[PDB]
Amino acid sequence: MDGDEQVEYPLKPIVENAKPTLRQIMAHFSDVAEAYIEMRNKKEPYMPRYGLVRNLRDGSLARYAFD
Amino acid sequence: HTVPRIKAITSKMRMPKSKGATVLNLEHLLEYAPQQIDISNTRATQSQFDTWYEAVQLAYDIGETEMPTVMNGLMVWCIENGTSPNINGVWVMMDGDEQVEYPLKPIVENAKPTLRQIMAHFSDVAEAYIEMRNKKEPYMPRYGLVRNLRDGSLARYAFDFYEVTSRTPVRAREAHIQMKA
Amino acid sequence: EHLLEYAPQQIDISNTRATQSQFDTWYEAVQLAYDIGETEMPTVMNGLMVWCIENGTSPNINGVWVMMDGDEQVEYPLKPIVENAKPTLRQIMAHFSDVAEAYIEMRNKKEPYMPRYGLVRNLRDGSLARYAFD
């Protein structure tokens, strides 16, 4: 995102050089993601789309609701 | 804070070149857009069709004001039969429940390269004639009739000298695969 | 040593494209046979690619190919073109294969354009037509 416009990047290099799996390597960011979600939830009701569409409804828990 | 955008690499096109000089003329190429109907290996060139049409006129010895009638029956005759008949023989037309015949030697001998590849000029019109006939009776050309085919509506695309372009329906386009198998 | 910097383009070392010498002989020999000035031959080859898109690349040795001047036909003998093409007309005219994509895309931007080869090859896809010549 650059000021209400979209820039795109190819996804082939990202999801192909991720051994063993993208989940098991991007989990390095899982610790920081809590800080980002908490910061966002301090200005608006923020809920990640994963736990959003997982029958879940709790708000405060949203800090722990990504894949 | 410029959020780097993946740089775009434009793979430069490779013009054919001889002795360090481009062969294609890029200018003329940008407006050289002829009809698909024109540049084909099926249809005969306008010169070859002109020679055939003129040579047939001299052999039959018929006035140019009346020849349109003669060629009017030539297309109809060639729909009902093939486009590679016997060199020696006749084709039949019609004046009120009687037959008039014309020798077939001049027609099938001055047709370069082949009678199919030169009579295909009539292939566009033949669709209009067949559709008109099918609007009053179940009409089927004898070629697709005896080619294991049974479809009725398709009959507009079931003669021997049919040429195929980009505007033929897929049902018509896939049909010629099976008949010409 | 040399192997660490010997990195030529893939376009160059192929068994499909003809060598620059063989393409040079064909382009020069056709010029002598047709007897056309080098300043005007670009026009002639401009229609040769378009003609070979609409048909195959293995036609009859004896015959003609058609070009166009304002709804009229001009023909050129096909014997010199298909006889001085070593090893084969397909393997030497493939120099034009890169440009042909640009021409087809330009045509398809104004009408539904499909080369007659892929047209009569059981194929039906439209956007793919940029990659459907012989």
Residue numbers in the entry:
A (entry chain Aj): 135 to 201
B (entry chain Aa): 42 to 222
C (entry chain Ab): 68 to 201
Can I see the authors' text?
Potyviral CP plays a role in virtually every step of the viral infection cycle, from transmission of the virion by aphids, virus assembly and disassembly, regulation of genome amplification, protein translation, to cell-to-cell and long-distance movement. CP consists of a highly conserved globular core flanked by two large extended regions with a high frequency of structural disorder. Here, we show that we can control the shape, size, RNA encapsidation ability, symmetry, stability and surface functionalization of nanoparticles through structure-based design of CP from potato virus Y (PVY).
In the absence of RNA in VLPr and VLPh, the C-IDR in CPr and CPh is disordered, with no traceable cryo-EM density beyond A222. In all three structures, there was no cryo-EM density for the first 41 residues of N-IDR, exposed on the outer surface of the filaments. Beyond H42, N-IDR in CPh+RNA folds similarly to that in PVY virus, whereas N-IDR in CPr and CPh takes a different turn at K53. In the absence of ssRNA, the N-IDRs adopt two slightly different conformations, as seen in CPr and CPh allowing the formation of two different types of RNA-free filaments, with the stacked octameric ring assembly being the more stable and therefore predominant form. Interestingly, only a slight change in N-IDR conformation leads to the formation of another type of RNA-free filaments with left-helical symmetry.
